Structure formats: C-alpha cells, structure tokens
A paper describes a structure:
The PT [name] from [name] DSM 1042 reported here is a member of a new type of bacterial prenyltransferases, as it catalysis the prenylation of a phenazine substrate. [name] is a soluble, monomeric ABBA PT consisting of 302 amino acids with a molecular mass of 33.2 kDa. The overall structure of [name] belongs to the PT-fold family and is characterized by ten antiparallel β-strands that assemble into a circular β-barrel. The β-barrel houses a solvent-filled reaction chamber in which the substrates bind and the regioselective Friedel-Crafts prenylation of dhPCA takes place.
Structure analysis of this crystal from (EpzPwt) and comparison with the two earlier structures confirmed that lysine methylation had not led to structural changes in the protein. Moreover, the EpzPwt structure showed that, in contrast to EpzPm-SPP and EpzPm-nat, the C-terminal portion of the enzyme was visible in the electron density and found to seal one entrance of the β-barrel. One of these, the C-terminal 310-helix in EpzPwt, seals the reaction chamber of the aromatic binding site of dhPCA. The aromatic binding pocket of dhPCA is located opposite to the diphosphate binding site, within a large cavity inside EpzPwt. Interestingly, we found substantial electron density in the cavity of EpzPwt, in an area near the predicted binding site of dhPCA. The density is indicative of the presence of an ordered compound. Although we were not able to unambiguously identify the nature of this compound, we conclude that it is inserted into the enzyme during protein production, as the shape of the density does not fit with any molecules used in downstream purification and crystallization experiments. In the closed structure of EpzPwt, R267 points towards the active center, whereas in the opened structure of EpzPm-SPP R267 is orientated to the solvent. The aromatic substrate dhPCA was docked in silico into the active site of EpzPwt by the use of Vina. However, as crystals of EpzPwt were not reproducible and other crystal forms could not be obtained, we were unable to prepare a ternary complex.
Residue numbers in the entry: 3 to 302
The structure:
Amino acid sequence: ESADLTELYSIIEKTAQVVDVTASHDKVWPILNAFQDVIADSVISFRASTGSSADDLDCRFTMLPKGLDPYARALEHGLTPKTDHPVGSLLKEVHENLPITSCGVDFGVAGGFTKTWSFPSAEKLGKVSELVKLPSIPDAVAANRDFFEKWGIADMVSTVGIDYSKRTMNLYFGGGVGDRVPAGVFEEKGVRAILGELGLAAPSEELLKFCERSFVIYVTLSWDSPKINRFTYSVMTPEPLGLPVDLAPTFERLIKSAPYDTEGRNYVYGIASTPKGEYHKIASYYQWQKRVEKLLRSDG
Ligand SMILES: [Cl-]
C-alpha cells in the first residue's frame, strides 16, 4: 500500500503541526518504509511533551510481532547508528532471556528512530532478577534491587524500553490485564517516599492528584550512573480534559484538534519526575487493535 504510507505520513505531519513541530520527511519516510510490513497490525499513538521534549512529536508503533527484532531492522535500514556501547546489544539479550511476546518502536518526527520496547505477556511478566544477569544491562538495575523489592515490583516488569539516542533504559510496571502495582505506590505517602529515596523533586499537588488515578509506573536508568534518573506515573483515560492538571496549550490542541478520532486506550498521560522538576507527556491513540484488549488494560 503505497498510499497507506503516504496517508500515514500526512496524519503524522498534521499531528506534529498541531503541537507546533515541523515533521521531517527525511527522518520519517525511511522508517515508515523500513517497518511497512508491521504497521497495519500495530497500535499507533502520537506523544507530545512539555519541557525540553516539546520540540518533537514521538510516533509509537507497538504490539509488533514476536519474531521481529526491531533494532536489527533499524540497523539494517540505516535508521540508527552502529555502536559498541551495550545499549546496542541489550535488546537481543532481553528477547532471549525474558518471556518477550511482542515489541514496539518509537521515533521523533524531527529526531528519527530513538527507542524500542520489548513486551512480556501479562501471563508471564519479566523479573529484575532475570535482567541483572544480562551482559548488557545497566549496573543501575542491580544497584536498585532493594528499591524494586521494597515496593514489591521486582517480579512484575511489564515492558523494557531502550532509548538508543539517550543511552537509557526504562523499566515499566503495571498495565496488563489482571495485574496490579501495589496500592501504596499511588498514595501520597508512597509517592513522597519513592521520590525522596530516588533523590527526585518532591511531588507537586498536581502530581499527587494525578497519581491517584495511575496504575502504571516506570523508572529510567542509564549506564553511566547507579541512580534512577526519573520516575514516571501514567494514567489512561478517554477524558484527558478531566485530569487534575493544568494542561499545556499544545496538549489541549492535540486533544481537540488532532486530524483523527482516538481509539482504544484513547489517551495515556504521564508525569515524569527528575532531580530538577517534573514534565508532562500525553499520547493520543490513532490506531488500536482489538486483539490487544486480551493483554492490556484499556478502559480509563
Ligand atoms: Cl505474533
């Protein structure tokens, strides 16, 4: 479908323009071509951000096939640089040693290819104890073992994200059908304790109210420090105008003026905490897949 990709690029360019980002065809088009065979059956969403990432729109294609190595695919098509850094060998170790059943890719309309995601099934989640054995894992995973076990999340890794551009990795917890992160992680006492322990900014009232609604968390780690760099809470909802946040103008426009109607999850909103403050993210769902409802929680 020549004109399926052309139509998709058009959606991408218009959506970027709603959040005041100029899309680069030279970055996007090679990627759409490289993954053309897995786009129709993927879940596609478009994510805007506040803070420094406000200069790009992330395009996410998830729930791609089990047999796909999306990093290998990107490398073969020249979309991401060949590297000797362990970031470039981690995905293969993850897929071999954790029960990974699907994957995903992220690219910026201006930045190009940036991340992969590796998804276990809700029936069999990943473990920090599996991750620490891998030759390419960040030291920070083992360094933070006590944190993961304290909060009861060490055996419920629901996604592994790898950012090739930043050389970081995200570990996600929650979000699967029948799965739960422990309740106390979302209550004010816990939110304060977690951000305190991790040396992150104290939670704003906005974050505290937002956390009440959350059932997914993720931590970002790097290879160059033992410290968790950020801790993010996410909320799924069809009614993002009802979230207890002061929405950025670009976010209001993406909600009201996207060139499509949202599907499935509709929206996934995130508030990231770093050592220096907080920033917000919102993902608007363009293409959903019904078969994913068996694996992922999708009402909000
Ligand atoms: Cl499959």
